DNA sequence: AAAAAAAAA
């Protein structure tokens, strides 16, 4: 038996589907696939799939992710076979993956009997409009949005029957999730008769089906969307959420239907898509830095690099300077944004007191100050981001809404904009113009971190953990430096007090500043010109060279670092000065409304603590040191003092200099 | 039986998590320890959700084959010294109790239950706790033992939470003769006014220190704070050999010279201490008097 | 086949008749005290069953729906043994006894339930949102034929039967049987809906609902809006009337219920807690020990806490022979500057009160508070559905951002709070409804 | 057929 790879080039059967299942070639495919995933070497010289299997064993999950381009660069014929005949290849590849997993963990079958594989990124991408007859029974990659999700129900996987006319027990049968098992002659007795399921000896799966429309960002303008049906098997249940744009790699298949034939009067068949991989594509449209189902996941070596680079001196400065590397100046805005997207620690006292652990930021200033670019970068880098703007958002659109389901005909809850911002940031542009009724509906979202609805006989409370970043413009289009903040905007104290860090940006006239800004802008414009081994990695090193000149660290490493710090590190607060902070709060209560107009309350003390915890988080440290508290108090004092009239700004600056000596 | 913390009354995951020997051998105070523990569990084959259930409802087949699972899996991680032989007592349909679990329950019930005037009040509280522990001995009472078991769990949690912070902060100063660490500030420091609780913490710390690559056997000094009295409670601790050592290097157990050092310093210098505990290596010293004293102990022949 | 059933019944009867700790046979005395008060039920604790013998618990955990009825008939056999005399040879109005279980196993969240929990005993917690009306079920059916016209009896168990084929032995039909409704035994069944607790919902998701079924004594025990702990069986029932292929909607069969309120709200308290409450009432500084206990995490406010305590205690309801009503509650309004901790007291007041609801005045409507007139799509009939001010009847309702509430919505509460009754007239429904809060 | 929630004038 010549089980050589080159013998697979030429087919002897009429089609691939009847050739792959041949016993002679199937074992060759299995052994070659084993030699592939046991020996594939990455750029560093180590088997990446080994680390993948170790991590899978740690997390005891169900899905092992195999990269498509890895299987394409080496052993392209197997990739072609997978692309043309997915159903017949995934079974063999699951078998070999199970063998590989049991190689590292003997007796792992007790944890789970079968393993499912996932394909990372197929080369060709289609749309819902571009679907034809040719691409049937083959892998497809479809981008869309989720509209209606049915739910979770079990299914039979290994079906057996007991025929009582002859006492015959049928063997284990499989189900294709869309076809009913139909047996004609009922095994050896060769006769049809009554039978029963006898489900005491059976195994179960769970499924979920969903409706997929077209993304409004890719539909032709003024046209209508197209709908398809997507079926999710085990380990893919509840991964997708309503209203979330997704990209699904799956298999295209067709089945008969009666009413569909009746209405059209022609032999037309229905089509469904069974999912094989899902990738969320909400907000973060930047999808060129790295490949994979998720870009916020880290390997063990990346964790090691995080720990190695999280201990160097002055990492806070590098993190701040590496954010928005194409915007000149505005150091305070960068620091505030970093402290807002790193967050704090929520506090629960005896399960009976609640302290919010997220920081809000309000921006304000003159036009032409690139606030919207900062907001766009924040949306790009955050894991969960939602963009609202001006009057285009309503009060019930941000919060939860109640809707009557057209099918079952009863009221149900519809997830609002803020619900999608859980463990994330919600970004608002043109905050000032938004109508007051559209603005007063986020007070609980800012402070109470919970949404309560009592409408149409439904009384429920919805949790919301979101950070709000807003941008606005002052009255008259410019900030009058010789007037207090109370006469610059129409917002009141109840909304102003809920913002921790408030930044005021002024556009002045300076010669050397203008020359420097012009030089930086011109060099940025020249830098981003579209015209200046494997060519792809040469393009990658060119991108890295172009990137290293404005940012101390690469962007994808920064995103994974932010995710890791938000997930695992929880700072603790023990050895801090009681009296310094208490006296500073007393001093801020002094002056303020007693001399000016800006409101200061107990919320700002908790804001100082949260900023200190955020600064502790940035270093991947479990305990808050004194330097972090000094930085936080300096930031808060500067932000307070830099929002007064020009008559008292110098006086307050020299009055508050005793707390931030350093 | 095994060197495990309340195996028959807590989940197997917590039993591995809180065990002092396992902690020392696998460094569970950082994340690599938890990763190694998860590798251990996955290779043994017990599901993470199954291992986090009560021992009563834990799967019967795995409870039966646990011995073989441990025998085949512990060798790679090097925990083959955890298996030993112990005594188990059963009375009717009540259940099963082991000697180690019973003594831990008794110790914790002694620890927790229910200037000079406050010291006398503390001492009478301690004698009342002793009487309650004595009453708990008889077989007719079991609500005085379930409470002790749950208090043991709580106290071990608190000790672990304080020790991880100490090891993070690196408060263990390495002097030329003896190591030193002082719990100047932190949470729940009022619990450590009990000498037996302080000895428990010191035992865990000395086990962690011994289970390292350092080749120095030095006595350890541990101190705490009682802000009401403004006094330090200082206890001297002896070094200990690794539990997995032969008898040839056990010619004589390690002695304790801290009592002699303290008595000599107090007899040659008018320090404001109060040496009255039956344990001669535990003293109460003043906050302002701790340091000079310390240098004296550094300069005196130990 | 029958030998194994007899062995299992004998094992359970031996467990009941032989289990003793110290000098008391607890279960026999429990059966006595239950029969004396006409509560034909028995409560089994898992720890006792495991301590007695492990094989019985193993068999119960393996296939519960097949084993439980054997235990529930062994219980009634023992009850007839130890409650009536043979008299050398009647009423015998003793139905099959109900079995209730308690356990302390690890809880399982609702969203964690999957295919591996089918036909297993699980313990979980949720919140009750709606209770169905009780319906009847048949247990002992007297069946009459039409052609041969003989009598037969059918005994039906509730766990996990159709008209028998052919007659009992001329030439009758396939199923020539009818149901004799008189001389038949019936029981009660009820349906409940369970919802995930707010603090355990995963990231960026929405609560999921589940359906539970209870029967006999377990019915009419809970009310909507109360946190409960349920132990039961997670099984699946097909839906012929009702997408997909070979689908099966799951549900829960209730075996045991624990509640914090313990359905106390006549007096259900025993003597120990009664004397404890009396001794606490003898404390001469109980007012301060209660004022200090209202949100000890909030500093400075004292008159607010005294007002909250006075509201929690409530007034004394009064009625007159003339028919007029007098209100028996006090309403407290907090109207002050921001940052003075007003909502943090509202959530704590919601937590302390036995019956309370917390809602915002912004996301609320007049029809979404008092009573919403829904319409069943199937039978096409109108019926009233409760809002938020009827769920909080007999308790306190927590409203924040009262000024953000719409003017048209704020007027419906006038009569509801000044007379404690709401009157509705919609689609021919004229009902006065009581709401005291 | 009748009640109740949402966006736009
Ligand atoms: N250092 C810089 N500061 C400000 N703007 C900069 C800087 N460098 C470049 N720019 C350019 O300034 C422009 C400002 O963009 P944009 O008009 O969106 O800002 P904005 O005034 O904050 O917007 P909006 O109207 O939403 O308030 C961008 O085109 C950006 O490329
Ligand atoms: N007296 C106080 N003692 C302790 N904490 C306080 C006190 N007053 C306010 N706080 C703190 O204020 C924070 C915010 O309070 P909260 O949002 O409930 O205020 P509020 O007065 O109800 O606001 P609003 O009027 O805007 O609804 C909380 O974290 C709480 O700890
Ligand atoms: Mg509020
Ligand atoms: Zn046959
Ligand atoms: Zn007949």
PDB file of N, CA, C and O in Angstrom, chain C residues 9-59:
ATOM      1  N   UNK C   9     -38.527  -2.269  47.190  1.00  0.00           N
ATOM      2  CA  UNK C   9     -39.540  -1.872  48.164  1.00  0.00           C
ATOM      3  C   UNK C   9     -39.150  -2.345  49.558  1.00  0.00           C
ATOM      4  O   UNK C   9     -39.295  -1.609  50.543  1.00  0.00           O
ATOM      5  N   UNK C  10     -38.647  -3.577  49.666  1.00  0.00           N
ATOM      6  CA  UNK C  10     -38.198  -4.087  50.957  1.00  0.00           C
ATOM      7  C   UNK C  10     -37.033  -3.271  51.497  1.00  0.00           C
ATOM      8  O   UNK C  10     -36.966  -2.999  52.699  1.00  0.00           O
ATOM      9  N   UNK C  11     -36.099  -2.882  50.628  1.00  0.00           N
ATOM     10  CA  UNK C  11     -34.971  -2.072  51.071  1.00  0.00           C
ATOM     11  C   UNK C  11     -35.442  -0.738  51.633  1.00  0.00           C
ATOM     12  O   UNK C  11     -34.998  -0.309  52.704  1.00  0.00           O
ATOM     13  N   UNK C  12     -36.358  -0.069  50.928  1.00  0.00           N
ATOM     14  CA  UNK C  12     -36.835   1.222  51.417  1.00  0.00           C
ATOM     15  C   UNK C  12     -37.650   1.071  52.697  1.00  0.00           C
ATOM     16  O   UNK C  12     -37.562   1.914  53.599  1.00  0.00           O
ATOM     17  N   UNK C  13     -38.451   0.007  52.802  1.00  0.00           N
ATOM     18  CA  UNK C  13     -39.216  -0.211  54.026  1.00  0.00           C
ATOM     19  C   UNK C  13     -38.298  -0.504  55.206  1.00  0.00           C
ATOM     20  O   UNK C  13     -38.548  -0.036  56.323  1.00  0.00           O
ATOM     21  N   UNK C  14     -37.232  -1.276  54.979  1.00  0.00           N
ATOM     22  CA  UNK C  14     -36.252  -1.517  56.031  1.00  0.00           C
ATOM     23  C   UNK C  14     -35.559  -0.224  56.437  1.00  0.00           C
ATOM     24  O   UNK C  14     -35.304   0.006  57.624  1.00  0.00           O
ATOM     25  N   UNK C  15     -35.241   0.630  55.462  1.00  0.00           N
ATOM     26  CA  UNK C  15     -34.662   1.931  55.781  1.00  0.00           C
ATOM     27  C   UNK C  15     -35.598   2.748  56.661  1.00  0.00           C
ATOM     28  O   UNK C  15     -35.170   3.354  57.649  1.00  0.00           O
ATOM     29  N   UNK C  16     -36.885   2.780  56.312  1.00  0.00           N
ATOM     30  CA  UNK C  16     -37.835   3.569  57.091  1.00  0.00           C
ATOM     31  C   UNK C  16     -37.988   3.004  58.497  1.00  0.00           C
ATOM     32  O   UNK C  16     -37.998   3.752  59.482  1.00  0.00           O
ATOM     33  N   UNK C  17     -38.101   1.681  58.620  1.00  0.00           N
ATOM     34  CA  UNK C  17     -38.410   1.063  59.904  1.00  0.00           C
ATOM     35  C   UNK C  17     -37.191   0.842  60.790  1.00  0.00           C
ATOM     36  O   UNK C  17     -37.362   0.542  61.976  1.00  0.00           O
ATOM     37  N   UNK C  18     -35.975   0.979  60.262  1.00  0.00           N
ATOM     38  CA  UNK C  18     -34.776   0.647  61.017  1.00  0.00           C
ATOM     39  C   UNK C  18     -33.879   1.847  61.294  1.00  0.00           C
ATOM     40  O   UNK C  18     -33.020   1.764  62.180  1.00  0.00           O
ATOM     41  N   UNK C  19     -34.069   2.963  60.596  1.00  0.00           N
ATOM     42  CA  UNK C  19     -33.216   4.128  60.791  1.00  0.00           C
ATOM     43  C   UNK C  19     -33.491   4.760  62.149  1.00  0.00           C
ATOM     44  O   UNK C  19     -34.624   5.161  62.438  1.00  0.00           O
ATOM     45  N   UNK C  20     -32.455   4.850  62.981  1.00  0.00           N
ATOM     46  CA  UNK C  20     -32.570   5.496  64.279  1.00  0.00           C
ATOM     47  C   UNK C  20     -31.240   6.133  64.642  1.00  0.00           C
ATOM     48  O   UNK C  20     -30.176   5.575  64.363  1.00  0.00           O
ATOM     49  N   UNK C  21     -31.312   7.307  65.262  1.00  0.00           N
ATOM     50  CA  UNK C  21     -30.153   7.986  65.820  1.00  0.00           C
ATOM     51  C   UNK C  21     -30.391   8.195  67.307  1.00  0.00           C
ATOM     52  O   UNK C  21     -31.451   8.691  67.702  1.00  0.00           O
ATOM     53  N   UNK C  22     -29.409   7.805  68.120  1.00  0.00           N
ATOM     54  CA  UNK C  22     -29.535   7.813  69.573  1.00  0.00           C
ATOM     55  C   UNK C  22     -30.685   6.911  70.008  1.00  0.00           C
ATOM     56  O   UNK C  22     -30.562   5.683  69.967  1.00  0.00           O
ATOM     57  N   UNK C  23     -31.809   7.501  70.421  1.00  0.00           N
ATOM     58  CA  UNK C  23     -32.930   6.726  70.941  1.00  0.00           C
ATOM     59  C   UNK C  23     -34.252   7.135  70.299  1.00  0.00           C
ATOM     60  O   UNK C  23     -35.300   7.076  70.946  1.00  0.00           O
ATOM     61  N   UNK C  24     -34.228   7.554  69.036  1.00  0.00           N
ATOM     62  CA  UNK C  24     -35.437   7.987  68.349  1.00  0.00           C
ATOM     63  C   UNK C  24     -35.480   7.424  66.937  1.00  0.00           C
ATOM     64  O   UNK C  24     -34.494   7.512  66.198  1.00  0.00           O
ATOM     65  N   UNK C  25     -36.621   6.844  66.568  1.00  0.00           N
ATOM     66  CA  UNK C  25     -36.923   6.509  65.178  1.00  0.00           C
ATOM     67  C   UNK C  25     -37.646   7.710  64.579  1.00  0.00           C
ATOM     68  O   UNK C  25     -38.858   7.867  64.745  1.00  0.00           O
ATOM     69  N   UNK C  26     -36.895   8.564  63.881  1.00  0.00           N
ATOM     70  CA  UNK C  26     -37.424   9.865  63.480  1.00  0.00           C
ATOM     71  C   UNK C  26     -38.542   9.717  62.453  1.00  0.00           C
ATOM     72  O   UNK C  26     -39.572  10.395  62.540  1.00  0.00           O
ATOM     73  N   UNK C  27     -38.367   8.831  61.470  1.00  0.00           N
ATOM     74  CA  UNK C  27     -39.297   8.796  60.346  1.00  0.00           C
ATOM     75  C   UNK C  27     -40.646   8.210  60.744  1.00  0.00           C
ATOM     76  O   UNK C  27     -41.688   8.651  60.245  1.00  0.00           O
ATOM     77  N   UNK C  28     -40.656   7.220  61.639  1.00  0.00           N
ATOM     78  CA  UNK C  28     -41.928   6.664  62.093  1.00  0.00           C
ATOM     79  C   UNK C  28     -42.739   7.698  62.866  1.00  0.00           C
ATOM     80  O   UNK C  28     -43.955   7.823  62.667  1.00  0.00           O
ATOM     81  N   UNK C  29     -42.082   8.457  63.746  1.00  0.00           N
ATOM     82  CA  UNK C  29     -42.774   9.521  64.465  1.00  0.00           C
ATOM     83  C   UNK C  29     -43.239  10.615  63.512  1.00  0.00           C
ATOM     84  O   UNK C  29     -44.313  11.199  63.703  1.00  0.00           O
ATOM     85  N   UNK C  30     -42.440  10.907  62.483  1.00  0.00           N
ATOM     86  CA  UNK C  30     -42.863  11.869  61.470  1.00  0.00           C
ATOM     87  C   UNK C  30     -44.123  11.395  60.756  1.00  0.00           C
ATOM     88  O   UNK C  30     -45.051  12.181  60.534  1.00  0.00           O
ATOM     89  N   UNK C  31     -44.173  10.112  60.392  1.00  0.00           N
ATOM     90  CA  UNK C  31     -45.366   9.564  59.754  1.00  0.00           C
ATOM     91  C   UNK C  31     -46.572   9.646  60.679  1.00  0.00           C
ATOM     92  O   UNK C  31     -47.677   9.986  60.240  1.00  0.00           O
ATOM     93  N   UNK C  32     -46.381   9.326  61.961  1.00  0.00           N
ATOM     94  CA  UNK C  32     -47.475   9.438  62.921  1.00  0.00           C
ATOM     95  C   UNK C  32     -48.014  10.861  62.973  1.00  0.00           C
ATOM     96  O   UNK C  32     -49.222  11.090  62.829  1.00  0.00           O
ATOM     97  N   UNK C  33     -47.122  11.832  63.174  1.00  0.00           N
ATOM     98  CA  UNK C  33     -47.555  13.215  63.323  1.00  0.00           C
ATOM     99  C   UNK C  33     -48.151  13.759  62.032  1.00  0.00           C
ATOM    100  O   UNK C  33     -49.001  14.655  62.073  1.00  0.00           O
ATOM    101  N   UNK C  34     -47.721  13.235  60.883  1.00  0.00           N
ATOM    102  CA  UNK C  34     -48.301  13.659  59.616  1.00  0.00           C
ATOM    103  C   UNK C  34     -49.704  13.094  59.436  1.00  0.00           C
ATOM    104  O   UNK C  34     -50.620  13.813  59.018  1.00  0.00           O
ATOM    105  N   UNK C  35     -49.893  11.810  59.747  1.00  0.00           N
ATOM    106  CA  UNK C  35     -51.207  11.194  59.594  1.00  0.00           C
ATOM    107  C   UNK C  35     -52.207  11.816  60.562  1.00  0.00           C
ATOM    108  O   UNK C  35     -53.382  12.004  60.223  1.00  0.00           O
ATOM    109  N   UNK C  36     -51.761  12.151  61.776  1.00  0.00           N
ATOM    110  CA  UNK C  36     -52.668  12.755  62.748  1.00  0.00           C
ATOM    111  C   UNK C  36     -53.232  14.085  62.260  1.00  0.00           C
ATOM    112  O   UNK C  36     -54.373  14.430  62.585  1.00  0.00           O
ATOM    113  N   UNK C  37     -52.457  14.841  61.479  1.00  0.00           N
ATOM    114  CA  UNK C  37     -52.884  16.151  60.999  1.00  0.00           C
ATOM    115  C   UNK C  37     -53.374  16.101  59.554  1.00  0.00           C
ATOM    116  O   UNK C  37     -53.752  17.137  58.990  1.00  0.00           O
ATOM    117  N   UNK C  38     -53.411  14.909  58.948  1.00  0.00           N
ATOM    118  CA  UNK C  38     -53.867  14.719  57.567  1.00  0.00           C
ATOM    119  C   UNK C  38     -52.941  15.423  56.573  1.00  0.00           C
ATOM    120  O   UNK C  38     -53.381  16.202  55.729  1.00  0.00           O
ATOM    121  N   UNK C  39     -51.642  15.138  56.685  1.00  0.00           N
ATOM    122  CA  UNK C  39     -50.641  15.564  55.704  1.00  0.00           C
ATOM    123  C   UNK C  39     -49.920  14.302  55.241  1.00  0.00           C
ATOM    124  O   UNK C  39     -48.869  13.939  55.770  1.00  0.00           O
ATOM    125  N   UNK C  40     -50.488  13.638  54.235  1.00  0.00           N
ATOM    126  CA  UNK C  40     -49.957  12.366  53.750  1.00  0.00           C
ATOM    127  C   UNK C  40     -48.720  12.646  52.902  1.00  0.00           C
ATOM    128  O   UNK C  40     -48.751  12.662  51.669  1.00  0.00           O
ATOM    129  N   UNK C  41     -47.604  12.872  53.591  1.00  0.00           N
ATOM    130  CA  UNK C  41     -46.334  13.140  52.933  1.00  0.00           C
ATOM    131  C   UNK C  41     -45.206  12.780  53.888  1.00  0.00           C
ATOM    132  O   UNK C  41     -45.410  12.633  55.094  1.00  0.00           O
ATOM    133  N   UNK C  42     -44.009  12.638  53.324  1.00  0.00           N
ATOM    134  CA  UNK C  42     -42.825  12.317  54.106  1.00  0.00           C
ATOM    135  C   UNK C  42     -41.629  13.010  53.476  1.00  0.00           C
ATOM    136  O   UNK C  42     -41.538  13.113  52.250  1.00  0.00           O
ATOM    137  N   UNK C  43     -40.715  13.484  54.318  1.00  0.00           N
ATOM    138  CA  UNK C  43     -39.536  14.215  53.875  1.00  0.00           C
ATOM    139  C   UNK C  43     -38.288  13.381  54.128  1.00  0.00           C
ATOM    140  O   UNK C  43     -38.060  12.924  55.253  1.00  0.00           O
ATOM    141  N   UNK C  44     -37.483  13.191  53.086  1.00  0.00           N
ATOM    142  CA  UNK C  44     -36.262  12.398  53.150  1.00  0.00           C
ATOM    143  C   UNK C  44     -35.077  13.315  52.897  1.00  0.00           C
ATOM    144  O   UNK C  44     -35.077  14.088  51.932  1.00  0.00           O
ATOM    145  N   UNK C  45     -34.072  13.232  53.763  1.00  0.00           N
ATOM    146  CA  UNK C  45     -32.835  13.980  53.601  1.00  0.00           C
ATOM    147  C   UNK C  45     -31.787  13.086  52.951  1.00  0.00           C
ATOM    148  O   UNK C  45     -31.676  11.902  53.282  1.00  0.00           O
ATOM    149  N   UNK C  46     -31.023  13.658  52.017  1.00  0.00           N
ATOM    150  CA  UNK C  46     -30.051  12.864  51.269  1.00  0.00           C
ATOM    151  C   UNK C  46     -28.977  12.281  52.178  1.00  0.00           C
ATOM    152  O   UNK C  46     -28.555  11.134  51.990  1.00  0.00           O
ATOM    153  N   UNK C  47     -28.509  13.058  53.159  1.00  0.00           N
ATOM    154  CA  UNK C  47     -27.413  12.596  54.006  1.00  0.00           C
ATOM    155  C   UNK C  47     -27.793  11.337  54.774  1.00  0.00           C
ATOM    156  O   UNK C  47     -26.978  10.416  54.904  1.00  0.00           O
ATOM    157  N   UNK C  48     -29.022  11.273  55.290  1.00  0.00           N
ATOM    158  CA  UNK C  48     -29.467  10.068  55.982  1.00  0.00           C
ATOM    159  C   UNK C  48     -29.489   8.871  55.042  1.00  0.00           C
ATOM    160  O   UNK C  48     -29.060   7.770  55.411  1.00  0.00           O
ATOM    161  N   UNK C  49     -29.982   9.068  53.817  1.00  0.00           N
ATOM    162  CA  UNK C  49     -30.045   7.973  52.853  1.00  0.00           C
ATOM    163  C   UNK C  49     -28.653   7.470  52.493  1.00  0.00           C
ATOM    164  O   UNK C  49     -28.436   6.260  52.365  1.00  0.00           O
ATOM    165  N   UNK C  50     -27.696   8.385  52.319  1.00  0.00           N
ATOM    166  CA  UNK C  50     -26.339   7.973  51.979  1.00  0.00           C
ATOM    167  C   UNK C  50     -25.675   7.281  53.163  1.00  0.00           C
ATOM    168  O   UNK C  50     -24.967   6.281  52.997  1.00  0.00           O
ATOM    169  N   UNK C  51     -25.890   7.799  54.375  1.00  0.00           N
ATOM    170  CA  UNK C  51     -25.283   7.188  55.545  1.00  0.00           C
ATOM    171  C   UNK C  51     -25.823   5.801  55.831  1.00  0.00           C
ATOM    172  O   UNK C  51     -25.081   4.914  56.261  1.00  0.00           O
ATOM    173  N   UNK C  52     -27.122   5.595  55.604  1.00  0.00           N
ATOM    174  CA  UNK C  52     -27.715   4.280  55.828  1.00  0.00           C
ATOM    175  C   UNK C  52     -27.084   3.237  54.913  1.00  0.00           C
ATOM    176  O   UNK C  52     -26.480   2.264  55.377  1.00  0.00           O
ATOM    177  N   UNK C  53     -27.211   3.431  53.603  1.00  0.00           N
ATOM    178  CA  UNK C  53     -26.588   2.545  52.631  1.00  0.00           C
ATOM    179  C   UNK C  53     -26.431   3.302  51.321  1.00  0.00           C
ATOM    180  O   UNK C  53     -27.315   4.072  50.936  1.00  0.00           O
ATOM    181  N   UNK C  54     -25.304   3.080  50.645  1.00  0.00           N
ATOM    182  CA  UNK C  54     -24.988   3.851  49.447  1.00  0.00           C
ATOM    183  C   UNK C  54     -25.659   3.294  48.197  1.00  0.00           C
ATOM    184  O   UNK C  54     -25.859   4.036  47.228  1.00  0.00           O
ATOM    185  N   UNK C  55     -26.001   2.004  48.190  1.00  0.00           N
ATOM    186  CA  UNK C  55     -26.584   1.400  46.996  1.00  0.00           C
ATOM    187  C   UNK C  55     -27.950   1.996  46.675  1.00  0.00           C
ATOM    188  O   UNK C  55     -28.282   2.201  45.501  1.00  0.00           O
ATOM    189  N   UNK C  56     -28.759   2.269  47.700  1.00  0.00           N
ATOM    190  CA  UNK C  56     -30.076   2.856  47.467  1.00  0.00           C
ATOM    191  C   UNK C  56     -29.940   4.239  46.843  1.00  0.00           C
ATOM    192  O   UNK C  56     -30.662   4.582  45.898  1.00  0.00           O
ATOM    193  N   UNK C  57     -29.014   5.054  47.353  1.00  0.00           N
ATOM    194  CA  UNK C  57     -28.806   6.373  46.766  1.00  0.00           C
ATOM    195  C   UNK C  57     -28.260   6.268  45.347  1.00  0.00           C
ATOM    196  O   UNK C  57     -28.625   7.067  44.477  1.00  0.00           O
ATOM    197  N   UNK C  58     -27.379   5.297  45.097  1.00  0.00           N
ATOM    198  CA  UNK C  58     -26.870   5.095  43.744  1.00  0.00           C
ATOM    199  C   UNK C  58     -27.999   4.754  42.780  1.00  0.00           C
ATOM    200  O   UNK C  58     -28.073   5.307  41.676  1.00  0.00           O
ATOM    201  N   UNK C  59     -28.896   3.854  43.188  1.00  0.00           N
ATOM    202  CA  UNK C  59     -30.020   3.487  42.333  1.00  0.00           C
ATOM    203  C   UNK C  59     -30.978   4.656  42.142  1.00  0.00           C
ATOM    204  O   UNK C  59     -31.541   4.831  41.056  1.00  0.00           O
TER     205      UNK C  59
END
